[PDB]
Amino acid sequence: LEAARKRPGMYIGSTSERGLHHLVWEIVDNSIDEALAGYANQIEVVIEKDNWIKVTDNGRGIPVDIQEKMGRPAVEVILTVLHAGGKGVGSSVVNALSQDLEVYVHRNETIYHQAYKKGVPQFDLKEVGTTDKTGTVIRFKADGEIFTETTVYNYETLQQRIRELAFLNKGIQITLRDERDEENVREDSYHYEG
């Protein structure tokens, strides 16, 4: 839990620009995972005001249904229990390494939401609207405490990895939007069929 917070290098490599951009990598790899299972074909990575990150896929939505073994909803589990769903480190490390984190699962024509602070859930999963679409949405502001030196994302850095991933995993459409400045909005959509 706090192991990722105490040993960040031992979990994301660097606590500099490399580690900051790596937070965006672990959340996107989660969407690529869902996409290679044949459920999502669209990923969107937005750099929002005050260097927040918003990752959106058109997947089935992280299961919201209670884990009959932990009692907590499945979405709360992957985001809170370290390394959950594997052995690529986990969306939970991106959680513990963020001062603020939000989750919006679109499933059962409804929006399930929950928010975290340094991994810690601020409240229990609540339903906050109805929806036509299915998928997951993650917003995070990397913790100012851990990422000493830089918290501002390099667009060209994100562009390069997104362009590569789109090409490796063909069929997937990954989009990058820079919204940090309302007056000049940047966008690059990557979709290779071959």
Ligand SMILES: C=C1CC[C@@H](O[C@H]2C[C@@](O)([C@H](C)NC(=O)c3[nH]c(C)c(Cl)c3Cl)[C@H](O)[C@@H](C)O2)[C@@H]2C=C[C@H](C)[C@H](C(=O)C3=C(O)[C@H](C(C)C)N([C@@H]4O[C@@H](C)[C@@H](OC(N)=O)[C@@H](OC(C)=O)[C@H]4OC)C3=O)[C@@H]12
């Ligand atoms: C916690 C969950 C619920 C969610 C599930 O992942 C989803 C993800 C999925 O929604 C899809 C890829 N996600 C997205 O679309 C997505 N989109 C975005 C923007 C994001 Cl973020 C995501 Cl995600 C996919 O569609 C569905 C089918 O699966 C996870 C996948 C596999 C596991 C079976 C996992 C689970 O039930 C686990 C458990 O019961 C235990 C927990 C309760 C402790 N656990 C373990 O958690 C640790 C101790 C481990 O530790 C490691 N490996 O270091 C093991 O533990 C062990 C003992 O090895 C690991 O395996 C047992 C688990 O991983 C599952």
